[PDB]
DNA sequence: AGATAATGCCAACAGT
DNA sequence: ACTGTTGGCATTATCT
């Protein structure tokens, strides 16, 4: 089952390790706000990356597959499918 | 060299 | 089940 539950919100998890991994979220120190939406972040790079997502179209794309990716390394990993 | 910005990895999560 | 997303976070790249 999932006996372990978050104290802050109504969530449940199988084991204490994943429980703590979730429960830390409610208490992290986030000093970096996004000027678009009031969402907070721990590192400024994370905040700027989030700001990227507020743009409608997803920036990165595949030259051959014609897909759309939010982040550079995801496009790089997708490029591995064309090993020939 | 020291401070700050970007990026890659990872786990949690969610659309299909 | 598959595979995209997200934010956190350590590490790397760029700026001063
Ligand atoms: Zn919670
Ligand atoms: Zn925002
Ligand atoms: Zn492709």
A47 and A41 in contact (C-beta within 8 Å)?
yes
User: Tokens 């897909």, residue?
Assistant: A67
CA angle, A25 as apex, A22 and A31 as ends, to 5°?
165
Q: Which residues contact A15 (CB under 8 A, 6 or more apart)?
A: A4
Question: What residues does A32 pair with on adjacent strands?
Answer: A41
Resolution (A): 3.0
Written as six digits, the tokens of A83 are: 């090993």
Question: CA–CA separation, A72 vs A10, rounded Å?
Answer: 35
Written as six digits, the tokens of A53 are: 């997502």
How many helical (H) and strand (E) elements, i.e. helices and strands, does chain A have? 3, 6
Distance A54 CA to B10 C1' (A): 23
Bases along strand B below 7 A from a protein CB: 4-9, 11-13
Written as six digits, the tokens of A80 are: 């591995």
A22 and A13 in contact (C-beta within 8 Å)?
yes
Written as six digits, the tokens of A31 are: 């000093």
């Amino acid at each position: 089952s999932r006996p372990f539950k978050c104290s802050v919100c109504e969530k449940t998890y199988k084991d204490p390790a994943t429980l703590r991994q979730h429960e830390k979220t409610h208490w992290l120190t986030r000093p970096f706000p996004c000027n678009i939406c009031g969402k907070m972040f721990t590192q400024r790079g994370t905040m700027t990356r989030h700001m990227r997502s507020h743009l409608g179209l997803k920036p990165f794309a595949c030259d051959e597959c014609g897909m759309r990716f939010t982040r550079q390394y995801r496009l790089t990993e997708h490029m591995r499918v064309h090993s020939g």
